[PDB]
Design a protein around this ligand. Sequence first.
Ligand code: 940
Ligand code: 940
Lengths: 143, 143
Amino acid sequence: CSPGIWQLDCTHLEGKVILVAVHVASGYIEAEVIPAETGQETAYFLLKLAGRWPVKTVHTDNGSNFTSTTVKAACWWAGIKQEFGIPVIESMNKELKKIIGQVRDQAEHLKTAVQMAVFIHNKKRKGYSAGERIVDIIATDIQ
Amino acid sequence: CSPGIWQLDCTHLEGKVILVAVHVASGYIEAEVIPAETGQETAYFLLKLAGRWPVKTVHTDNGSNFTSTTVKAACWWAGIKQEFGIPVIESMNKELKKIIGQVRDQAEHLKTAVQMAVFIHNKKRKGYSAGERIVDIIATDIQ
Ligand SMILES: Cc1ccc(-c2c(C)c(-c3ccc4c(c3)NCCO4)c([C@H](OC(C)(C)C)C(=O)O)c(C)c2NS(C)(=O)=O)cc1C
Ligand SMILES: Cc1ccc(-c2c(C)c(-c3ccc4c(c3)NCCO4)c([C@H](OC(C)(C)C)C(=O)O)c(C)c2NS(C)(=O)=O)cc1C
């Protein structure tokens, strides 16, 4: 239900790493292919994300993802807090993968298919779409 | 005033290319550093953008940016239309640059400074922030 809560995880496909962020209340996602599963990539990603949406806290299924100096710096600067599992489910990474499989032949590069999958997932009404729900959640929260 | 209209342009700083997209009604921006000023980069960018926001039409100050087969394909797939200048102002690229200059020492890489600049610009209340205005514009348009 909370407006600023996001979940961030890496998956793998085709020998490559996909970083997936989910806005938990809405199910809206942002994902991209990253060259390697490093702190640098995660830090840059978080900075982009924070600039675009209100990101108040981030949860993850791999806490170690967040130990890098580099990630800590991005969360410090953007003012993001961790939500520890120390501290309800998802399997979006399966759903995303499903859509990625459906569109895969439409593109050469996996990264391209991923963006196609994100678009499709975000716009799928089923009731609003996730894209509609996140703005409605954010707008309501504002006013 | 229209909800789906975006403006897209490349600028240069430090020998590098920054692609800047503006949501015209709100002044909200997304920007990133791209390795080169090519159709491939623009096409991928548009695909990301379309997945995240309702992108109905895109305007540009360099029409030739949109001639590549690659861009045409991304606009075809995402269903984006061009708005020809054939066919009110901006200078965001100056404002962005200004903010980029202010934060530049905070980061090593220009790309990092850019994301910092985007965040700052989007959250600057001055009245809502641009970030607030785009969601309010989008939500209202939905319902
Ligand atoms: C004559 C011709 C011109 C362009 C493409 C092409 C296209 C259309 C796309 C292409 C562009 C936009 C698209 C799609 C493919 N697929 C659907 C969504 O929008 C892509 C995609 O890579 C980028 C450009 C997205 C980085 C790809 O991964 O397939 C790639 C990699 C393409 N190949 S290209 C020209 O070497 O970049 C193919 C041909 C046969
Ligand atoms: C011990 C140490 C550890 C990390 C960094 C560092 C940081 C903190 C940042 C860094 C990370 C997050 C940040 C900032 C810098 N600046 C403010 C916003 O959040 C960056 C930025 O590059 C990436 C990671 C964003 C790709 C950078 O361009 O400066 C870079 C490139 C850094 N350098 S590093 C470790 O080689 O990637 C520096 C030191 C001295």
